[PDB]
Amino acid sequence: VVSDPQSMKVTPIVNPSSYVCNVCNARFSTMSALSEHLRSDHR
Amino acid sequence: NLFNVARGNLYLVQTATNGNWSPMAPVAAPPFVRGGPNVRVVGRFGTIVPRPNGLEPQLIDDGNVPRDIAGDWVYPSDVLQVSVAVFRDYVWPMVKAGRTRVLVELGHYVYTLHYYDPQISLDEAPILEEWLSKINPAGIPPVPFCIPIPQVYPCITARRVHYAFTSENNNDSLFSTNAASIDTAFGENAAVSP
Amino acid sequence: LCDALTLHIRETYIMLLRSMHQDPTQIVQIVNECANNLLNSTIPISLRP
User: Fold this and answer.
1) Residue B6 and residue B76: Cα distance in Å, rounded?
2) How many CA atoms lie within 13 A of B162 on its CB side?
3) Which of B64, B128, B131, B134 reaches 20 to 30 Å from B106, CA-CA?
4) Contacts of A23 in chain C (CB under 8 A)
5) Does B49 touch chain A (CB under 8 A)?
6) What stretches of chain A show up as alpha helix (H) in DSSP?
């Protein structure tokens, strides 16, 4: 990884950790608590 | 445009340019217009229905039919002030992926120009994502454009990724582009208009 | 070992609750119409047998 200023910088395509929780509709800040709420949702 | 109000409507397509990028004066035709071929319009709510077991979230269109996200969209600004939380989560990553193009159409608006050096690499995502963060149901912050500083020498510009450009020539108030130089090499050489 | 008379009561009580089963896929259209179409929602249910 060489730091040259002309390297095409691209920001991450998918917004990090948006509240797309599968059934939880509660989103924890970290990725670990994001999938933990579907476990905390229902069985 | 001499009062910092640009007419026309704004676009958000992903244009990974390397040469001159003039957002306020598009040298091309606008990519699509309202009601064109495969150009659907978002509904009054902007509501996004999510589909299960790994399908795409579909977005409810003008005639209350859940059309899919990837493609083209005419997104009226009053819908954007009430559903910018559904924009920035679902339909905006499909802009940066380069698979959907939204014509966020507001008839008139105040604008802002962030100039930059085209030698150095720059992505116009956080300048634009800060603009999507200050949209309330009340108002919208002015539309931020990124125009390169016109260079005097033929430079080796970085490949940049810009998103916002308007539909019509909103470059009325551009008096000159390098008023103390022999000639503009790279940028938009707009001489003093007689 | 289940009683027959007790079973005839509890089989009625399931029929009492399955006579109240609003299927939850239509709760979206209830909220959309009870609010005079001023306010629409999306309620992702999880269909089970």
Assistant:
1) 17
2) 24
3) B64
4) 44, 46
5) no
6) 31-41
